[PDB]
Paper text:
The semaphorins are the largest family of evolutionarily conserved axon guidance cues. The semaphorins signal through their main receptors, plexins, which are single-spanning transmembrane proteins expressed in a variety of cell types, including neurons, cancer cells or endothelial cells. We determined crystal structures of Drosophila Sema1a1–2, Sema1b1–2, Sema2a1–3 and Sema2b1–3 to a 3.6-, 2.8-, 2.1- and 2.5 -Å resolution, respectively. All structures contain the sema domain composed of a seven-bladed β-propeller fold, which is followed by a PSI domain.
In the crystal, Sema1a1–2, Sema2a1–3 and Sema2b1–3 form a disulfide-linked dimer, while Sema1b1–2 is a monomer and the lattice packing provides no evidence for Sema1b1–2 dimerization within the crystal. In Sema1b, the equivalent cysteine residue at position 254 is naturally substituted by a phenylalanine, and thus Sema1b fails to form the interchain disulfide bond as compared with Sema1a, Sema2a and Sema2b. When we mutated the phenylalanine 254 in Sema1becto to cysteine, we observed a mixture of a monomer and a disulfide-linked dimer similar to that of Sema1aecto. The low propensity to non-covalently dimerize and the natural substitution of cysteine 254 to phenylalanine together contribute to the monomeric state of Sema1becto. The monomeric structure of Sema1becto we report here raises the intriguing possibility that semaphorin function may not be restricted to dimers, but also monomers could contribute to the complexity of biology mediated by the semaphorin family. In class 1 semaphorins, two distinct loops with no obvious structural and functional role are substantially extended from the bottom face of the β-propeller, β5A–β5B and β7A–β7B in Sema1a, and β2C–β2D and β6C–β6D Sema1b. The latter loops in Sema1b also showed a higher level of fluctuations relative to the rest of protein in the molecular dynamics simulations. Intriguingly, we found that the cytoplasmic domain of Sema1b lacks the sequence previously determined to be crucial for reverse signalling of Sema1a22,31, and therefore, Sema1b might be incapable of mediating reverse signalling.
Author numbering: 42 to 146, 162 to 569
The structure:
């Protein structure tokens, strides 16, 4: 008991073989894609509401086992859900390495409207290496097209990345896909070509495609004409920067004031000492990287600089043209030859928001409660991160202006680090329901509900101030640590105490004797 165990509110337990995956969630209900089943689960008590079962035919499982896969692989793990603009429901599952998609239509309705192949639209294995995004009525999938797992692609409406071309994709493991401003952004880690000796170094990338892409002319009609990617830069600055090059998870786009943010979790490679980090990226900075120079093709010398400014095609590559079929073969071949941008995307504040180095666990999940108003009146993003150990870490960031020198100092206020899952089980995903004050930890075979904020669970004044949660404040009128977002303060907060910009011992000093 070196770390305290968190107060588990509710639990939804399945077998370890289930390999749960969250498909859709809001503040009240969440969908869980599992082995042969997808679950509609209410968030107040983690109680099941609606169940849809879908099993592989014995013909499908037999051929799957004949294909050389084990029993746990020869099932139907549901991995793709989308609410179509017709009110229909789209469901796709692995189906024992024979992926298929279906359309569906108090009261539970389960009528199979359609059933068709899902090659390139759905993964073959429950492995969490692939992602998707349903944007403007189409499915933008990033997965493998083959049974062996050696043909990665990004696909949508018969438009795919170049097959067996390592310049666009080099053994990628996808971690997420976000729609934004007429683009679809993909986040993944892959092998690096830009290194001089082509060494097996993993780099983290953000890639984008135009949604209005209609392909190129002639043989380019089945390939993207707007595929670009840039490296993500999550590193500790210095004379010798310390990089976290393997992205592991991302959060949805967070709205923090006038800025749109994406929080991501990075780990170090196997050689550098084991390390984890949380970096945030500005969406305006991500989109700006695709306005820069193009990294030239890895020529034999490999010391080549970015492409000459006069060598880029007449319209800029990656710019969403109305009809991309009118583009020339020279312009389409160019963006196929130079899909990698020269400059990398810088992280917000130019450094990780949290680092974890030389520890017996790595960060795995991420979730954000944005713009929590502190007692003082400032707004902070409360960031949640999970580990392969089963722990959850709350923290906020405070940036100091001229505290000692003109250089700004960014500090990390760790709110709590508690054990949530059994000490062995890793944390796959994190879902936040602010209205129910619930953080839902997701493992392979369980959902666990723990309080999003422990204001109502602490009774001591010293603990209410030492917690340094921007949402918990201590009322002196009534000895009760109150939640500023949920609890009602009709008599005002003038008698409240909170200290976020101090030491955890300096905060408890403000608390009365
Ligand atoms: C992801 O994001 C991260 C975070 O943002 C990025 O991280 C960056 O990483 C790069 C490298 O990848 C770093 O570049 C190095 O920067 C430092 C510092 O440069 C600044 O400061 C210089 C002056 O500092 C010195 O002088 C002042 C007084 O003048 C003194 O007070 C101070 O104490 C200090 O002593 C400036 O000169 C420099 O400005 C220059 O560059 C500007 C930008 O181009 C330009 O605007 C200026 O006009 C000017 O041209 C800047 O302000 C540098 O130390 C370092 O320089 C080394 O590397 C280059 C590479 O070609 C080389 O040409 C240099 O000669 C130098 O190489 C020596 O140092 C190496 C470092 O140890 C050493 O390994 C070498 O062997 C070599 O050493 C030889 O000479 C030295 C004596 O000089 C001797 O000790 C050796 O034994 C040997 O004889 C780099 O420029 C960035 O700092 C870093 N950024 C941050 C914010 O941390 C990362 O790039 C991003 N990744 C991606 C993919 O995007
Ligand atoms: C998982 O479980 C929850 C719990 O039931 C479930 O949430 C429910 O969603 C349905 C919609 O699918 C909600 O029912 C709607 O209520 C609105 C009232 O505003 C009605 O207008 C809706 O009618 C629709 O269809 C009509 C024609 O058929 C149209 O005229 C109309 O415009 C609507 O389009 C519909 O009755 C229901 O309120 C919630 N339940 C709760 C408690 O909120 C969820 O759908 C389940 N499945 C998932 C998430 O896939
Ligand atoms: C979970 O595994 C057990 C094996 O001990 C099995 O009996 C049970 O049926 C499984 N769960 C479901 C929902 O089938
Ligand atoms: C995930 O997809 C990549 C894409 O190339 C593939 O190489 C890999 O085998 C798949 N599975 C895992 C576990 O990475």
């Amino acid at each position: 008991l070196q770390t305290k165990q968190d107060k588990v509110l509710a639990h939804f337990i399945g077998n370890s073989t289930d390999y749960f995956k969250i498909l859709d969630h809001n503040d009240e209900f969440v969908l869980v894609g599992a082995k042969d089943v997808i679950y509609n689960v209410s968030l107040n008590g983690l109680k099941e509401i609606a169940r849809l079962e879908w099993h592989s035919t014995d013909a499908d499982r037999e051929l799957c086992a004949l294909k050389g896969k084990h029993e746990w692989d020869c099932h139907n793990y549901l991995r793709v859900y989308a609410l179509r603009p017709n009110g229909e429901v789209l469901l796709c599952g692995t189906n024992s390495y024979k992926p298929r998609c279906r359309h569906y239509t108090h009261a539970m309705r389960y009528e199979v409207s359609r059933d068709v192949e899902a090659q390139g639209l759905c993964p073959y294995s429950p492995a969490h290496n692939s992602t998707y995004a349903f944007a403007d009525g189409h499915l933008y999938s990033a997965t493998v097209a083959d049974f062996s797992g050696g043909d990665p692609l990004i696909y949508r409406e018969n438009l795919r990345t170049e097959q067996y071309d390592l310049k666009q994709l080099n053994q990628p493991d996808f971690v997420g896909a976000i729609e934004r401003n007429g683009y679809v952004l993909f986040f993944f880690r892959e092998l690096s070509m830009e290194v001089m000796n082509f060494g097996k170094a993993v780099y983290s990338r953000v890639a984008r495609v135009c949604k209005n892409d209609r392909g190129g002319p002639y043989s380019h009609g089945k390939s993207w004409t707007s595929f670009l990617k840039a490296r993500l830069n999550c590193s500790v600055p210095g004379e010798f920067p310390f990089y976290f090059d393997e992205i592991q998870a991302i959060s949805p786009i967070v709205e923090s004031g006038s800025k749109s943010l994406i929080y991501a979790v990075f780990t170090t490679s196997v050689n550098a000492i084991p390390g984890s980090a949380v970096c945030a990226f500005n969406v305006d900075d991500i989109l700006a990287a695709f306005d820069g120079e193009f990294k030239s093709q890895k020529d034999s010398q490999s010391h080549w600089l970015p492409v000459e400014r006069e060598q880029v095609p007449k319209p800029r590559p990656g710019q969403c043209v109305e009809d991309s079929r009118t583009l020339t073969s020279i312009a389409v071949n160019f963006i196929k030859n130079h899909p990698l941008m020269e400059e990398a995307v810088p992280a917000v504040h130019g450094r990780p928001l949290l680092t974890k180095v030389n520890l017996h666990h790595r960060l795995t999940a991420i979730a954000v409660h944005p713009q929590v108003k502190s007692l003082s009146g400032a707004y902070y993003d409360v960031i949640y991160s999970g580990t392969d150990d089963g722990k959850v870490t709350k923290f906020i960031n405070i940036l100091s202006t001229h505290p000692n020198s003109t250089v700004d100092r960014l500090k990390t206020v760790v709110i709590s680090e508690m054990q949530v899952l059994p000490l062995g089980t890793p944390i796959r995903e994190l879902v936040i329901s602010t209205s129910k004050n619930s953080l839902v930890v997701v493992s392979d075979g369980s959902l666990v509900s723990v309080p999003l904020h422990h204001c109502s669970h602490i009774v001591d004044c010293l603990g209410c101030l030492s917690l340094q949660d921007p949402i918990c404040a201590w009322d002196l009128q009534t000895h009760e640590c109150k939640n500023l977002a949920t609890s009602q303060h009709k008599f005002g907060t003038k008698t409240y105490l909170q200290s976020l910009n101090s030491t955890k011992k300096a905060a408890a000093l403000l608390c009365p004797h």
